[PDB]
From a paper:
Recombinant proteins of KAI2 and KAI2ply2, purified from E. coli, were crystallized. Comparison of KAI2 and KAI2ply2 showed that there was little structural difference (r.m.s.d., 0.2 Å) in overall structure. However, in detail, we found that the residue A219 of KAI2 was bound to aromatic residues as Y124 and F134 of the lid domain by hydrophobic interactions, while the residue V219 of KAI2ply2 was bound to extended aromatic residues as Y124, F134, F157, F194, and H246 of the lid domain. The entrance of KAI2 presents an opened pocket and hydrophobic charge for the ligand, whereas the entrance of KAI2ply2 forms a closed pocket due to C-gamma 1 and C-gamma 2 of V219, which is a bulkier residue than alanine. The results showed that the amino acid residues of KAI2 ranging from 125–150 exhibited a higher B-factor than those of KAI2ply2, implying that this region, corresponding to the helical ‘lid’ domain, might be more rigid with lower motional amplitude in the KAI2ply2 protein. We found that the Tm of the KAI2ply2 protein was increased compared to that of the wild-type KAI2 under CD assay conditions; the Tm values of KAI2 and KAI2ply2 were calculated to be 45.23 °C and 49.36 °C, respectively. Thus, the Ala219 of KAI2 appears to be important in forming space for entry of the ligand as well as maintaining flexibility of the lid domain.
Author numbering: 2 to 268
Write the structure that this text describes.
């Protein structure tokens, strides 16, 4: 199947009860490796890769399509339609949380709940909003990515993942980051860092569970409070006593039980 192949779609199980898991920048569906084992006996589990991940064909990366997060939301809806899924719990890591939110505005019927891990609607600070970054900080980042990609990957992965600098998770994320084509990494990094989803949050109607590490390079804790205050749906927040932007990969013993409780239990 064309969509299946392009996004490396994997489907594990057959019930109606379905969970779809979307990954963040720099990684792939393997970020879910410590969560999936605990879902498959109860749910049909769907994994996919975002266009532009290093596991995808760079020929399919259309810079205009992906110039806004809406392109990735259309991909998500296409995957759901291709699989004939009528409803799912969507678990979105990092940018995928916002991708799922956008998809839910167009097709709320397809989602019963969104569980977000490491989400942010806006990374750039203004005089009334803390997102974590000044524009000049983002400018430096993009220049690094342009100048020497390998070296940028090696420096960034430990910061993003947190914990011990030579952990297996750091190594894995360095590998997946460097698997991206450099031009695509740069373009998508800019699209994400410059995004702004704040204005649409009041229109969300699907219930959201907002989870993050207490220490996350890209997500100040106040962002979780901001999502909770401004989302128009029912929501709950749980800050986890963990380090890292990919804590489901790097700190599973502390993080997986929290994600599971939010998947299995409704607000």
């Amino acid at each position: 199947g064309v969509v299946e192949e392009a996004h490396n779609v994997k489907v594990i199980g057959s019930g109606e009860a379905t969970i779809v898991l979307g990954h963040g920048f720099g990684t792939d569906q393997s970020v879910w490796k410590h969560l999936v084992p605990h879902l498959v006996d109860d749910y049909r589990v769907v994994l996919y890769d975002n266009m532009g991940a290093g596991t995808t064909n760079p020929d399919y990366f259309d810079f205009d399509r992906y110039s806004n997060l809406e392109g990735y939301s259309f991909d998500l809806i296409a995957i759901l339609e291709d699989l004939k899924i009528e409803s799912c719990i969507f678990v979105g890591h990092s940018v995928s949380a916002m991708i799922g939110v956008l998809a839910s505005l167009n097709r709320p019927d397809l989602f019963s709940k969104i569980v977000m891990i490491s989400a942010s609607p806006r990374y750039v600070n203004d005089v009334d909003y803390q997102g974590g970054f000044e524009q000049e900080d983002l400018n430096q980042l993009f220049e690094a990515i342009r100048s020497n990609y390998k070296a940028w990957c090696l420096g960034f992965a430990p910061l993003a993942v947190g914990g011990d600098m030579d952990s297996i998770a750091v190594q894995e994320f360095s590998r997946t980051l460097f698997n991206m084509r450099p031009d695509i990494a740069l373009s998508v990094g800019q699209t994400i860092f410059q995004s702004d989803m704040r204005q649409i949050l009041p229109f969300v109607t699907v219930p959201c569970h907002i989870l993050q590490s207490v220490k996350d390079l890209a997500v100040p804790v106040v962002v979780s409070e901001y999502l909770h205050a401004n989302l128009g749906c029912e929501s709950v927040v749980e800050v986890i006593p963990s380090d890292g932007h990919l804590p489901q990969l790097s700190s599973p013993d502390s993080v997986i039980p929290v994600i599971l409780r939010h998947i299995r239990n409704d607000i």
